[PDB]
Each structure stands twice: as C-alpha cells, then as structure tokens.
Design an enzyme around this catalytic site. Structure first.
Site: not given
Ligand SMILES: CCCC[C@H](CC(O)(O)[C@H](CCCC)NC(=O)[C@@H](NC(=O)[C@@H](NC(C)=O)[C@@H](C)O)[C@@H](C)CC)C(=O)N[C@@H](CCC(N)=O)C(=O)N[C@@H](CCCNC(=N)N)C(N)=O
Lengths: 99, 99
Positions: B25-27
């Site tokens: 998950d690069t995101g």
């Molecule tokens: C909105 C922030 C950028 C998006 C990414 C999304 C993702 O982690 O790639 C997750 C992958 C986890 C899979 C559920 N993908 C998703 O959430 C995507 N979901 C999906 O693709 C599928 N859904 C599911 C439940 O699998 C599909 C069936 O819809 C949605 C974007 C929709 C298309 C994400 O949530 N990143 C978090 C992961 C948690 C972590 N690693 O800490 C992050 O880095 N968060 C940062 C800050 C980002 C800000 N967020 C916020 N609410 N302000 C942090 N917490 O430190």
C-alpha cells in the site's frame, strides 16, 4: 520515473482543467479527488477504508494527466482527505511496484 | 518482482510465525495488521484513512516477512479492513513505484 517510498509518492495531476497534487496509491482500487466539478453524468458510490466509508460521486470516462502521462477512467469525487490516484488509473500509466 | 496493478497487490506476509495476506500500500505511511498478539510493549497511535481516524496499537521492531523479504520494523495493530504494508516496510524491502 522511479519513485522511492521514503516520503509519500505525491505527483502533480491535471484533471478537469485543474492542477492538483495526488498520492499514488497502490492500496486504492479507485481514484478519488477532493470536491471539484467534472462534466457529464455521475452516480453516487460509497467507498471505504480505514475509518469507514465516505460517499462520493462517480464520473466515468474522465481524462487525467498523471505526472505527464495521460489516461482515462472513472474518477470519484468527494471528501477524501488527500487526492488519491488508485489502481484503475495507475495501470493506465504503466505503474508497477518493484522490489 | 515487478507487480502490476490490474488486481490488488496482495502478498503473503509472515508475522508471529503465521502467514497472512496483506496489501502492498504505497498510500499508507505505516503498516497495519488486524488484531493479533505481538510481543512487547505498545504505544498509542491514531491513524487516518479515507473514512476517518482509528486508534491502533504501535509495536516497534517486529520481525515480519513480506513476500519472502525480511523486515524488522513498526507494526500497528487495530481495526483495519485489511492488512496493509505501508511505506515504513516497503522501504525496508526496497520497493519503488515505476512508470
Ligand atoms: C486518505 C489517506 C490516503 C489513502 C490511504 C488509503 C489506503 O491505505 O491505500 C487504503 C488501503 C487500505 C485498504 C483499505 N485504501 C482505501 O482506503 C481505499 N479502499 C479500497 O480501495 C477498498 N476498500 C477496502 C475496505 O478494502 C475498495 C473495496 O474500496 C479507498 C481509498 C477507496 C478507493 C490511507 O488510508 N492511508 C493511511 C493508512 C494508515 C496509516 N498508514 O497510518 C495513511 O497513510 N494515513 C496517514 C495520514 C493520512 C491522512 N488521513 C486522514 N483521515 N486525514 C497516517 N495516519 O499516518
């Protein structure tokens, strides 16, 4: 290009005549952009991940330019915390994850 | 490997001697795993996803193999929808995005 992952892989996109920064997100099925207008028909969709779901508007056949690479696909628009380019458009630009 | 994005980039990971599926998950800044037992002390962390924020437990210096590649680093445990390998570990395994 080769984009390391020491920092968030943010790139410039052009969509709807606007320049935006977006995150290349191999964990996202779909591409989600913060509120903006797009042309044509849309339908509502719920998308979910950490923290649950948000409601978005789904626009199909939207042209985008990601880091200078053109593609077309579905774009969801709604209250995403960061613009995300998901796999439906990452494929189109030929993005792979390599290790 | 070189992983295309036509399907979700799911891989097998090994943590605590057990194989699990996870998403590359690069995101994701961080790596988050569903509820399981890990050793040692944990620290609190709040992380934000597409739908909002959740509380997780942060364990540091955890041995984890990701698609056969050995890493040792921070694993968050909490109510993620799916196990996600984020950038903290993708950098350990030498992963890049390429297009
Ligand atoms: C909105 C922030 C950028 C998006 C990414 C999304 C993702 O982690 O790639 C997750 C992958 C986890 C899979 C559920 N993908 C998703 O959430 C995507 N979901 C999906 O693709 C599928 N859904 C599911 C439940 O699998 C599909 C069936 O819809 C949605 C974007 C929709 C298309 C994400 O949530 N990143 C978090 C992961 C948690 C972590 N690693 O800490 C992050 O880095 N968060 C940062 C800050 C980002 C800000 N967020 C916020 N609410 N302000 C942090 N917490 O430190």
């Amino acid at each position: 290009p080769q984009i390391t992952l020491w920092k968030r892989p943010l790139v410039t996109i052009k969509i709807g005549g606007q320049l935006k920064e977006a995150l290349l997100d191999t964990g996202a099925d779909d591409t989600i952009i913060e509120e903006m207008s797009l042309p044509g028909r849309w339908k509502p969709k719920m998308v979910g991940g950490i923290g649950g779901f948000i409601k978005v508007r789904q626009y199909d056949q939207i042209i985008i330019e990601i880091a200078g690479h053109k593609a077309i696909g579905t774009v969801l628009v709604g209250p995403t915390p960061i613009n995300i380019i998901g796999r439906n458009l990452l494929t189109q630009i030929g993005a792979t994850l390599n290790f």
